[PDB]
């Protein structure tokens, strides 16, 4: 019972975009993708719905634009790998405007500091928030973090 992207104002097609390190690819194959698609949901995958002829930049915009929600699977790999484009991006574009909701950010794993580079800016911004949602070490909390991760994509954009 998630949200019908129809009923919605804009033209959607999915009902989040996930944005991951092909390092993280096997949680987030046989875990996440796998809670959010048995529930029926529509998700837009780096890479699974990117378009040839085109850059990644406008592949990830596209899938973004796409989505009711969109979804960081943060990570130390996350950092080295992905964030560069957001953090090149975000300088140009206000993609998220600081305060709504449309952005989902998971903690997969814990990011030391000193991994973080000094020009990340928009990164420690959004990480200052701590509204970011923990994956668990307790198998016991797994069930909370699924159920709040469903709720931060069904739940309705901020106007």
């Known amino acids: 019972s998630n949200?019908?992207?129809?009923?919605?104002q804009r033209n959607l097609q999915f009902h989040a975009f996930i944005s991951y390190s092909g390092?993280?690819?096997?949680?987030?194959?046989?875990?996440?993708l796998p809670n959010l698609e048995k529930e029926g949901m529509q998700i837009c995958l780096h890479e699974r719905n990117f378009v040839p002829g085109k850059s990644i930049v406008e592949n990830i915009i596209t899938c973004i634009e796409?989505?009711?929600?969109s979804?960081?699977?943060l990570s130390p790999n996350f950092v080295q790998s992905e964030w560069c484009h957001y953090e090149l991006y975000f300088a140009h574009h206000n993609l998220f405007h600081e305060g709504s909701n449309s952005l989902i950010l998971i903690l997969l794993?814990?990011?030391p500091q000193y991994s973080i580079?000094?020009?990340?800016?928009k990164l420690k911004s959004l990480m200052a928030r701590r509204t970011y949602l923990e994956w668990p070490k307790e198998k016991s909390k797994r069930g909370l973090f699924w159920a709040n991760l469903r709720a931060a994509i069904n739940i309705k954009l901020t106007e």
């Open 3 to 8: 949200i019908p992207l129809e009923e919605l």
């Open 23 to 32: 390092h993280d690819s096997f949680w987030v194959k046989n875990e996440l």
């Open 66 to 69: 796409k989505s009711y929600k």
């Open 71 to 73: 979804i960081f699977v």
């Open 109 to 111: 794993e814990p990011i």
């Open 117 to 121: 580079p000094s020009s990340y800016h």
